[PDB]
Symmetry: D2
Subunit: 311 residues, 4 copies
């Protein structure tokens, strides 16, 4: 039927626990689909190498297909999506999808999710909107998308800025696109990288130990993202250790444990004074993604901050 | 006749200044209560700690028959943790209401004044008793267990994001339609009156390619318990998993919670808690699971007994 | 095996689009001894008073013959029927409503698992004395506060003001809330001998609203009118005037709100006592209609109706 | 150096007042524009403000005349100023905003603002709301984003913005597609812009109009009476918008009346009483068969705005559906 060619890159996850494609015979109505297995892991075990493989795969295979769907565990899909959002140079739709219920359960969500991810990958209007996550009839941008609930099939939301489009009857009404620079408009280029800078996450809370921050420091980590309290604030011991790290060759990004809203400049922390960077709307795991990539370009906290204001 | 209400002041943006100052800026408190202020500490709640926790519980318990209710003025950033600590440790049967402010007192449309007003309204309402320790923010009565910050700056940030609020405040009156089922205050076995420290519990975060070095550092330091902020339904990165499995075998209490802001970390999912001796946190977020785990550790070190605690409180 | 006896009363809805509903979910036999009866077979957009009277009477009459009930229903008005049953069911055992947002033949159709979970809830001894319930997307919701939030989302049903009662995981429920308002055997509404309910209609407010709907309901002698008001139950001027007239010439007038969350309060911009109006509080216009209809079976007096709206 | 900002005042609770800081009771549109401006002396740090009283009412009484007046004044005064703020009641702000979104041709920012607490209330929300509205109207980045609503530190597009709560200061949300930007320390980080066509990309021109087509709204629910629909039909309404159940469905009696109406000279639009999500084509109602139009994400009161303006161009239900799909 003059249909597009869509490539599925499989990484594992609950959606996949070749016969994945076969369980959605209706895919034949909308695309000529071909699958490849890149890895087969639970996304709780997602890592830098898988990321690099995947960006490299998409970038080199871009001209052989019309669109990509990546099948992926839900738990870290939001990280993978932002990492691809920043490192993919291919102009064609790249769509991640997962399932909250196993494939063998009652009212399993994966089949229709897969169908809708292919719809989205096949839609010429999906191009130039960056890397996308399609979950529960909704097209979500790679940067803002996050999990909101541990088990709900509707868990994926773009909690700060909203979704891009809703899918009804195999058609999308797009009403938004992300303003922040993505894909071809980023300076990030991992084509020749076999590793990424080391970036770890420390949590803040009443009476918080400095021992985690200390441990990352002791190991020579290139960057530390703080999951701060409220508007990216730090427990006094963690503050002291990160203040030292920032002046001793470690990039420090203030983010927040709070699920929505920006960690802003000009609030209780003098970031200029400490050599810190404020993560804006990027949650701790998102901020790690961008901090890693920023570190491949620069160690300068003021250039890092600018990166955090543009990507 | 108006109620005697005691404000225990701890600092926070609501104060940023002594407690006398706070009370005198909201003269309308004179129409609903006889307010007395005591300064307990004066800190940003980012610097909240176990010694202040223990001070507050002890104070409230000791001065319970001196007053008709308590309001605790507090920073927002960690209010949700103090409220839960107090919810499990206070034995006083009179209302205990925590408040703060998302905007500085000097700010245009500062939220602090009406927030404090409504906190006193709540503390003064007889209907407020026996509902546990409460947080009052943005015209809403929230329970200390479920209440959490939802946004970094929004005045409406405080929400009980899994089971909802208790009541809404309009024209100085509350319409309560909910009370928390989990055991609280005088129905808990937790008693901190003779404690001068709490057991040591830290929180580690999970994410892609997560370092095991945070968890190992806590283990090396002999931490009594570790709370994991897992991915999805409390899952762990493979390295972190290995580290905590080993720790649990030698007697560290390990609690699986989630970085995901709503919903339960369940038993009977991808992790065989029984096999590993882990505890599942239910709807308790990592900071809240810490509060409960520290208290559970004052009663037992047995993970099945800690799990029953996590199922009842 | 020693399983509870659970009755499915079928009313139609996309979940059906009884005997073959039950057969579609074999896993039911693991949790309940299930039997179905067809009550009606309609899309819930055509839900009506006569079906509500039939359901209430049936549950009340058949209460001793079963351990609990699941009511399969369309999604569009399930929130209405749920609150009607909440106020009229005298049976003490669980009554759980369930529907499906996706057609039964669609990919990832939600009906099978929803129904599984509705039987789980009906079977749970802990579900008793919580009022009539709606079970949708793994969540147990109370009949008073439950409403649609989205036109098509499988997660649409939420208790938007006070939250859910429990969450369902692996066939078990962790309940942490129960509705304070009075329900079921604690209400005085008794529909057992009623062949009809009082006429209550709903008018919508907006900029430049016409009084012509309100005037039509008054002209026809309606027993009450619910206003879907703007903001905190406010009324377009011409609508205000017509409802004021109606309030003093027999018609009970409830101010509710078009706005999806929050109470319509007393003591804002409208002096309800002066006009003889009743504030709906957290009841949305379709829910306020249900309560107003039932109030009007007990009293026409606006203070007593306000008291009912403060208690149920 | 500072921009020129015009405040066109309409009333609302933002200019309302009560008998005490602490009682909820208040009255709307007493206080004049000048009193609001003088309560925010910080305005002086960010704009040269000029205020004009257009009307002084509760937005509950907003109407087609006030809309027409506002649109004509903004289009007429566009070169006199760097941007406009319209102070307005909250209850129908979402309607005026979308009306203006479709009819204003001026290509400078037009920002609407209210308050959920009156000026006399403890922790009154108006003054900071006003300040942030002016910051929004002053920001060169706010241009070419349509008409805006600024409430609780958030910039919202006129089309999607709506009230979600009867009393919460945080009530205004863009419930389907989200906000455009958040305001912190007098600055906006814009991340979105509405895709649907607005202002100078719409064919709607009300400059010569003194009245708009008559369009009413009927609610759906169990046992719905057909009497409200019939009343609108007997008066010769130009259009009727149904606030449907679920995905724009209609109670059988209402369906029967509106079926007649669509083929007997009345435009009918299916919307939904459900607060978020689209009323779609290709669900349970064959719109083509019945001559109906589906509202998409437009709620009943927003769908009335677009239908009224659509009726100024066309009576053809196919053309009206094309309009609901573009604007
Ligand atoms: N642990 C699974 C969860 C899921 O896919 O639902 C994953 O991330 O791989
Ligand atoms: N950092 C402050 C924030 C506030 O109170 O708004 C605190 O938590 O103490
Ligand atoms: N119109 C159907 C919708 C559904 O059940 O999903 C009904 O309410 O009966
Ligand atoms: N009824 C008032 C409500 C408010 O503005 O808060 C108005 O819309 O004018």
């Amino acid at each position: 039927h003059h249909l597009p060619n869509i490539t599925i890159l499989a990484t594992g996850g609950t959606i996949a626990g070749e016969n994945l494609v076969n369980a959605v015979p209706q895919l034949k109505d909308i695309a000529n689909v071909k699958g490849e297995q890149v890895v087969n892991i639970g996304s709780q075990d997602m890592n830098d190498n898988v990321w690099l493989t995947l960006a490299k795969k998409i970038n080199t295979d871009c001209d052989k297909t019309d669109g990509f769907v990546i099948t992926h565990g839900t738990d870290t899909m939001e990280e993978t999506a932002y990492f691809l959002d920043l490192t993919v140079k291919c102009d064609k739709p790249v769509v991640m999808v997962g399932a909250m219920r196993p494939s063998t359960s009652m009212s399993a969500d994966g089949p229709f999710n897969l169908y809708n991810a292919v719809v989205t990958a096949a839609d010429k209007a999906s191009a130039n909107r960056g890397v996308l996550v399609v979950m529960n009839d909704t097209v979500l941008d790679g940067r803002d998308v996050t999990m909101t609930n541990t088990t709900d099939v509707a868990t994926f939301k773009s909690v700060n800025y909203g979704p891009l489009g809703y899918i009804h009857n195999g058609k999308i009404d797009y009403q938004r696109t992300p303003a922040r620079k993505h894909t071809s408009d980023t300076p990030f280029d991992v084509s020749k990288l076999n590793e990424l800078p080391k970036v770890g996450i420390v949590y803040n809370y009443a009476n918080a130990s400095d021992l985690p921050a200390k441990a990352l420091v002791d190991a020579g980590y290139d960057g530390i993202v703080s999951a701060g309290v409220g508007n990216g604030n730090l427990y006094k011991s963690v503050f002291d250790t990160l203040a030292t790290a920032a002046k001793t060759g470690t990039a420090v990004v203030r983010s927040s444990r709070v699920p929505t809203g920006a960690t802003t400049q000009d609030a209780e922390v003098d970031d200029a004074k400490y050599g810190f960077v404020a993560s804006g709307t990027l949650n701790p795991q998102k901020a790690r993604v961008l901090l890693q990539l920023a570190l491949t370009q620069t160690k300068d906290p003021q250039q890092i901050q600018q990166i955090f204001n543009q990507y």
